[PDB]
Amino acid sequence: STLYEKLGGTTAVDLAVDKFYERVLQDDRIKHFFADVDMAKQRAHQKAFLTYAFGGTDKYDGRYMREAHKELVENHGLNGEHFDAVAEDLLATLKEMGVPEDLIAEVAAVAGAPAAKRDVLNQ
Numbered sequence: 213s214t215l216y217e218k219l220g221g222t223t224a225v226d227l228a229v230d231k232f233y234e235r236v237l238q239d240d241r242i243k244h245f246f247a248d249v250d251m252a253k254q255r256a257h258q259k260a261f262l263t264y265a266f267g268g269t270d271k272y273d274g275r276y277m278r279e280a281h282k283e284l285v286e287n288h289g290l291n292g293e294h295f296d297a298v299a300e301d302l303l304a305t306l307k308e309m310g311v312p313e314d315l316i317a318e319v320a321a322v323a324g325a326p327a328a329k330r331d332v333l334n335q
């Protein structure tokens with residue numbers, strides 16, 4: 213059972229995702245990776261990342277993660293600094309929203325988990 217459960221329903225999830233989206237949209241370190249992507253799809257990405265980071269790793273197979281980001285790695289220069297900025301942006305969002313520091317630390321551990329990071333980064 214999902215994200216919808218752990219943050220507390222539609223409105224909580226919508227707040228989380230909108231704030232995370234808003235932060236990433238304004239983050240000069242990482243915005244150019246979404247240059248070829250419309251706002252609906254960028255938002256859907258932040259919803260996916262957030263879903264992954266709250267323990268729904270379930271539907272992001274590492275092989276999908278590797279193919280999905282391959283052109284970013286090869287052509288946009290995607291690397292660890294960028295990955296870490298996305299995770300950092302999520303944690304900053306959750307903290308602004310009063311999520312308990314114990315829970316932010318739990319998502320910090322999934323967001324930054326090594327094996328999915330190495331798949332995304334095509335390492």
Ligand code: HEM
Nearest residue numbers: 242245246249253254257260261264272280294295298328
């Ligand atoms: C574990 C971390 C991440 C997960 C779980 C993840 C997940 C995904 C998934 C599922 C897609 C495919 C969407 C589709 O097929 O429509 C995707 C696409 C994408 N990801 Fe990630 N991603 C992660 C990290 C990153 C990072 C660090 C960046 C860049 C800083 C990034 C940039 C993008 C881009 C540019 C796309 C292509 C456009 C889009 O479909 O939104 N992702 N990501």
